[PDB]
Amino acid sequence: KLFEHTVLYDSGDAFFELKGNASMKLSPKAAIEVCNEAAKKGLWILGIDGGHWLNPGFRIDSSASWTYDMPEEYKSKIPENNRLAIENIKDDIENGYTAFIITLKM
């Protein structure tokens, strides 16, 4: 990997610059940034895994796993995919989750 598993990245830019798809640990702030950049890039968000950052260490919680399979005609639905993804992250924050891993269709 081009990034460190021992680091909780706080900027969405790191996700793209360091190729963190489906693997990089993101702070809540960074997770939202990645979702917004995904939309701007025309990328569908397939899933978001929520968990806790243990300073250091990521512990995934399967009950926080959000999944949205991409339909055939998906481009016009990206805005909704984005909205639901961000709503999901905000709901996880309300539930005490402190880190996320995002999977985009790339």
Binding site: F58, R59, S62, D69
Partner: protein, 93 residues
């Protein structure tokens, strides 16, 4: 086994190949977990999940499968030596 688009996309980024998953599962159950996902976690149908799950593999290198649907619900990141196993996993049973 059922592998959705999300898991398929995660596989190459988490060190798993189609064969790795199949082999790990064929080796037999090594633990149990549960697939509890609220309706909002499963767009666009929003059915959610409330099913027992089985774990295959070992710490840091495991796959979780929904007992009812056959869906792979989680795959560990084998590229992360510090991956902390999901708290719901109970090894042995």
């Amino acid at each position: 086994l059922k592998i959705d688009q999300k898991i398929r996309g995660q596989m190459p980024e988490r060190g798993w190949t189609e064969d790795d998953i199949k082999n790990t599962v064929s080796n037999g159950a090594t633990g149990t977990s549960f697939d509890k996902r609220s309706p909002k976690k499963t767009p666009p149908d929003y059915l959610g999940r409330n099913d027992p799950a089985t774990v295959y593999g070992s710490p840091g290198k495991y796959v979780v499968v929904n007992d009812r649907t056959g869906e792979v619900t989680q795959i560990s990141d084998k590229t992360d030596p510090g991956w902390v196993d999901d708290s719901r996993i109970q090894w042995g049973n």
